[PDB]
Amino acid sequence: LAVDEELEKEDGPPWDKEYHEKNKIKHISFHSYLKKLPLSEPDFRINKRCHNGHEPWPRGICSKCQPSAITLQQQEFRMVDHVEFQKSEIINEFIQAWRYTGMQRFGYMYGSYSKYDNTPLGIKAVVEAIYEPPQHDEQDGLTMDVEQVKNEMLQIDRQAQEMGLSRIGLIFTDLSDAGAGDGSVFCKRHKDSFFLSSLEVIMAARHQTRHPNVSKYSEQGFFSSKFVTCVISGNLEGEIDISSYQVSTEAEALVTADMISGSTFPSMAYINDTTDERYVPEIFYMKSNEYGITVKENAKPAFPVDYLLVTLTHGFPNTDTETNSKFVSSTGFPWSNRQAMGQSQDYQELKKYLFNVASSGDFNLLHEKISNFHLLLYINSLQILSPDEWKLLIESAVKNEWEESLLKLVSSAGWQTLVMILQESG
Amino acid sequence: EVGYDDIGGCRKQMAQIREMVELPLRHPQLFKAIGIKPPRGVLMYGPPGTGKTLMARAVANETGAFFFLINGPEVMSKMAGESESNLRKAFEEAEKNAPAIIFIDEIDSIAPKRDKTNGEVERRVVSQLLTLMDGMKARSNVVVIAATNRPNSIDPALRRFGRFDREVDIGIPDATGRLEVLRIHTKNMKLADDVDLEALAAETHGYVG
Amino acid sequence: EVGYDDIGGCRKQMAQIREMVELPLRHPQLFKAIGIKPPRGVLMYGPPGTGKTLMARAVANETGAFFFLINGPEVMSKMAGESESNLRKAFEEAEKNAPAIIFIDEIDSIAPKRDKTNGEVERRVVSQLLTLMDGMKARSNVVVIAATNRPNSIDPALRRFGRFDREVDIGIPDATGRLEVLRIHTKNMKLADDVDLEALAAETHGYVGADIASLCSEAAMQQIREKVTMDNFRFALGNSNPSALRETVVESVNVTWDDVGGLDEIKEELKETVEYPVLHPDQYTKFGLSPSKGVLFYGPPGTGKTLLAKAVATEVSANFISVKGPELLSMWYGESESNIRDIFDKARAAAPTVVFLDELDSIAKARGGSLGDAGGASDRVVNQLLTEMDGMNAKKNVFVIGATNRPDQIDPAILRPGRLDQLIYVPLPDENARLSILNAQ
Ligand SMILES: Nc1ncnc2c1ncn2[C@@H]1O[C@H](COP(=O)(O)OP(=O)(O)O)[C@@H](O)[C@H]1O
Numbered sequence A: 001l002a003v004d005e006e007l008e009k010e011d012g013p014p015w016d017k018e019y020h021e022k023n024k025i026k027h028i029s030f031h032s033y034l035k036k037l038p039l040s041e042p043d044f045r046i047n048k049r050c051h052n053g054h055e056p057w058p059r060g061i062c063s064k065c066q067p068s069a070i071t072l073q074q075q076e077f078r079m080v081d082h083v084e085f086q087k088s089e090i091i092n093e094f095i096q097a098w099r100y101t102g103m104q105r106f107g108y109m110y111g112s113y114s115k116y117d118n119t120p121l122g123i124k125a126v127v128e129a130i131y132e133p134p135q136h137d138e139q140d141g142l143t144m145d146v147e148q149v150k151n152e153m154l155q156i157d158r159q160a161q162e163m164g165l166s167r168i169g170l171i172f173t174d175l176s177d178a179g180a181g182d183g184s185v186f187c188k189r190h191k192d193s194f195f196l197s198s199l200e201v202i203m204a205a206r207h208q209t210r211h212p213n214v215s216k217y218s219e220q221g222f223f224s225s226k227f228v229t230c231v232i233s234g235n236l237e238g239e240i241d242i243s244s245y246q247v248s249t250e251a252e253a254l255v256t257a258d259m260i261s262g263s264t265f266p267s268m269a270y271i272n273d274t275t276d277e278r279y280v281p282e283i284f285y286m287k288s289n290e291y292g293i294t295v296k297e298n299a300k301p302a303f304p305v306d307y308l309l310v311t312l313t314h315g316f317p318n319t320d321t322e323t324n325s326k327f328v329s330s331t332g333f334p335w336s337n338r339q340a341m342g343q344s345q346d347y348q349e350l351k352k353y354l355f356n357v358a359s360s361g362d363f364n365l366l367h368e369k370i371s372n373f374h375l376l377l378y379i380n381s382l383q384i385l386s387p388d389e390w391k392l393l394i395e396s397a398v399k400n401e402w403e404e405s406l407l408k409l410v411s412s413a414g415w416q417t418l419v420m421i422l423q424e425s426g
Numbered sequence B: 001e002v003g004y005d006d007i008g009g010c011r012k013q014m015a016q017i018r019e020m021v022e023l024p025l026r027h028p029q030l031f032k033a034i035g036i037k038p039p040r041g042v043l044m045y046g047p048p049g050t051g052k053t054l055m056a057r058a059v060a061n062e063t064g065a066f067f068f069l070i071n072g073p074e075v076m077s078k079m080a081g082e083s084e085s086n087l088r089k090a091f092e093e094a095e096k097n098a099p100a101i102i103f104i105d106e107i108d109s110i111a112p113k114r115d116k117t118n119g120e121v122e123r124r125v126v127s128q129l130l131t132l133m134d135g136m137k138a139r140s141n142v143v144v145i146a147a148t149n150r151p152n153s154i155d156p157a158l159r160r161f162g163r164f165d166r167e168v169d170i171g172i173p174d175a176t177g178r179l180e181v182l183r184i185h186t187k188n189m190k191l192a193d194d195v196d197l198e199a200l201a202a203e204t205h206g207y208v209g
Numbered sequence C: 001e002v003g004y005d006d007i008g009g010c011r012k013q014m015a016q017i018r019e020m021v022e023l024p025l026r027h028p029q030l031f032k033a034i035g036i037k038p039p040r041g042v043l044m045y046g047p048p049g050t051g052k053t054l055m056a057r058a059v060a061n062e063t064g065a066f067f068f069l070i071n072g073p074e075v076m077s078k079m080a081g082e083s084e085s086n087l088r089k090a091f092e093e094a095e096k097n098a099p100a101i102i103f104i105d106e107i108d109s110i111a112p113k114r115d116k117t118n119g120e121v122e123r124r125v126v127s128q129l130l131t132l133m134d135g136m137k138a139r140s141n142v143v144v145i146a147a148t149n150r151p152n153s154i155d156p157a158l159r160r161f162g163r164f165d166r167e168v169d170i171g172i173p174d175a176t177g178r179l180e181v182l183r184i185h186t187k188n189m190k191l192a193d194d195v196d197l198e199a200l201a202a203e204t205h206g207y208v209g210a211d212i213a214s215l216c217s218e219a220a221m222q223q224i225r226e227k228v229t230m231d232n233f234r235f236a237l238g239n240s241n242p243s244a245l246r247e248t249v250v251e252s253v254n255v256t257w258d259d260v261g262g263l264d265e266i267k268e269e270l271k272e273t274v275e276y277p278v279l280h281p282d283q284y285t286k287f288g289l290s291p292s293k294g295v296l297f298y299g300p301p302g303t304g305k306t307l308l309a310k311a312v313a314t315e316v317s318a319n320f321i322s323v324k325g326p327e328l329l330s331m332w333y334g335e336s337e338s339n340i341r342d343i344f345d346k347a348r349a350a351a352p353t354v355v356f357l358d359e360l361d362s363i364a365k366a367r368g369g370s371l372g373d374a375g376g377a378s379d380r381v382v383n384q385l386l387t388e389m390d391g392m393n394a395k396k397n398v399f400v401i402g403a404t405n406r407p408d409q410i411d412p413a414i415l416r417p418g419r420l421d422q423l424i425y426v427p428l429p430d431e432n433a434r435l436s437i438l439n440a441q
């Protein structure tokens, strides 16, 4: 990734704590965290060599090689500081799936990274489009099959590397509509209630262990994975404003696979025990005493989740000027896996959407009708055209100076048989 | 891994340390209804270079029970506290799931005599070591094993019946105790038969294994 | 980088380290199904002029292992909690980048003997070096080398088969051992044809090896000051100040070269006794007899006595160590006997050498009773030097030059003929000896 090497040259000290509290910044950055330190991922597993003569497996864990009591502090740094969108209709299309059936949805985000200039040595995460996986959805939540969707996201990630796209985040909806005629939604996630449900932290943290971030200052080549978690819940007063958080890299790269499970309370999680499979240390945290202040009040059956999340800021690009947007053709096409709704189609939708608009008319409106995200995944999944023609279809959609690439596209025999098989079919 | 045959080379001091921790486990029905508790703390001393660090690993495979191990000065970390609580973390973890074998090493550097040193951490390390060995009906599961070469530098209150008694002396083996050391670390090596090994038992005498 | 060619001379000692680190990792298939693993620690003792950091980097660069140097007195602090984990985190750091060399240096403040029992932080760092290295990993990846200037001050309980149990000796480099040292340091910035390197090796007698490496950098500074030749190395020779003559300085220093002595009938005898074994070593081995060890001068004082002491040392390639008469004998009880002890092992480590003993009557009294001329009557300082002449040790090439005023108190116990060889007497100079001494001045 070219974003990691560009911030190594610039120095920006940027790790000053008194400067970031002036501008209302919670945590500094990832790159200014590097220059203050030697990038070691903290491990909580049991050891198998132990540097002594005792047996590793049954018992015999010495104090020099024991995971100590976790003080359970928040992360002092962030991977990315501000996630940026590109169009207000991609979010409006995702909430439109909830408006038709009433139940929740789920999706993955595609995009890239660049430089953030508000924060010293910060990274901003630009999304480009939203993919929807196959899912089964209830009114309280959703949990799809694990295996059959992971088989599906290998080839569409193989289908996304030629444009310069990559899976950078995920979204899941939680609306809880009040009365639908005197207000938008309720206020389910606020300061008094839970901020993120503990059943979704284990799905957020597992996506970072499989999507490693390449770092040259580490010992294993990967440290502090860059994967954002976005949610559409709603703000306090009357809107459906979104929130974006990330999990801590000091614990969730290691502790989620063994000793983290979902409890019955939404603000806490259930601690697990290994019963001599591995060693689970003790968790220390704080609360407020009724008359004074406590010190170390709870050992086993409680730990909050809000010690473990960092905050991020979402944003939308301005309407008057922008650098690039790269994907605006309609943003109203039927998506991939909206099978519960009515937008799951066939060759009939190509007659209704474009039909290679005004067949022998022009090309300027055709360029603004073929650079859609879910359109190019559909016509390549039909695999009628040759693979070298599909490479030319990429530079004719998302790449600038598209005029000399579009005329050589339609003059080939690959584009001619698509409009011949479309006119005969319904 | 090492075992009872790999530690072979001492005979009289081997049977004293073997029946101290294996006989209450292999045959627990004879102590019951006898009125006496089994001995609960091993303290083996002697000259340096003998197998006081490798006896504990040897019956830290043959018993098949819950071994442990604490090094000497790694428990001493700089906090106002936790130099006594990391000692407590090593004992309260070893309390549950009977039986229990725990080995503490280098008791000559840590836990010195009380009135012969001047350090405020050293006044608290000695008594936290005492209190976890006899507190308020403590010493119910654990069996401590010590290993040092300077028994005169330790605290005189440490060698009591409840914490460290039936101490075994591991001396210099020369009266057919030296020859048994030769037959252990040579059966793994390739030896061409051209000489006898019994003439080497009386060539040098200050060898300690 | 530099490897296996940094110093000449003591290379059979470096070959012992070559069969300790490289030879396991070059053929690890030969060390499985053989049984017992090689030892994992070498204590290199000797004078701390060589430093040993320049030899340990030559071994580590040839094998490709990591070199993570840890200084001696930096791991000891006054906060008493991190001093036992600053060393423990060093072996935790050298575990990941296997193979690696730790190479702890100056083991005097760190890991001392527990015979004193003084200081809690000094008694725990011995046990921290104890409690890990027994369970240290095998197959030659985390090996440790030791550099210590005194081998009798560390804990003897430290050495049980695996900590430092491969002892090696590093002493003063002898003749044809310092010649290869200057061949390495003069590989760049080549000298001219006027200076000879073999005559350069005859000027250095008992240097520490790293002193003549700094002598080349000092003489090269004279060439840039002139804007390297023979006169630039000659001026840097007197300003080098080696460790044999560092402890005593009498201003101003004199170095004479135009003295040969007018006592020629004994000059061929002095060349026969102490100069023939140091020039023809193989002939004494082919005959199987020990060479001449000592000689004694007696007669009138000031008649060429100290002149014979400095004229011999300028002609031999060995260094000169001189005692000042009744100056090493102090009124304090114990170290007055130790003042003979520290001057003979330094002479044996700097073999070959010549020591000069003057005014023997003020120290010996030859046995006399339990009474003393001053009143101390310390008969143990004469019995101490009685033992340091032959001893129970290796027969070194040390030579002793005796000088006294009156042979009445001559000691019959110091005179067994294996100790001193010739009881020669110097007379007053005659008329033919007076003409050979006026032109030499
Ligand atoms: N029965 C034995 N006789 C002689 N040497 C032994 C015996 N058992 C172990 N050793 C040797 O002792 C060493 C390991 O324990 P050791 O270093 O003596 O422990 P400690 O110094 O703590 O007493 C190894 O060198 C091993 O070969």
Ligand SMILES: Nc1ncnc2c1ncn2[C@@H]1O[C@H](COP(=O)(O)OP(=O)(O)O)[C@@H](O)[C@H]1O
Residues within 6 Å of the ligand: C006, C007, C008, C009, C048, C049, C050, C051, C052, C053, C054, C055, C173, C181, C208, C209, C210, C213, C214
């Ligand atoms: N015989 C020798 N012994 C040790 N070092 C030598 C020898 N000959 C040349 N050298 C080199 O000379 C330099 C001086 O040694 P060093 O120990 O670094 O000196 P110092 O103790 O003054 O710091 C080193 O680079 C060393 O390798």
Ligand SMILES: Nc1ncnc2c1ncn2[C@@H]1O[C@H](COP(=O)(O)OP(=O)(O)O)[C@@H](O)[C@H]1O
Residues within 6 Å of the ligand: C301, C302, C303, C304, C305, C306, C307, C308, C429, C433, C434, C437
């Ligand atoms: N005939 C002589 N014999 C010996 N030394 C002589 C003679 N004439 C002059 N000298 C000089 O006088 C000095 C005294 O001789 P030396 O034995 O060295 O004295 P000291 O015993 O005081 O050290 C020397 O420098 C020596 O060369």
Ligand code: BEF
Residues within 6 Å of the ligand: B048, B049, B050, B052, B053, B105, B147, B148, C130, C131, C134, C160
């Ligand atoms: F030799 Be000790 F018991 F580590």
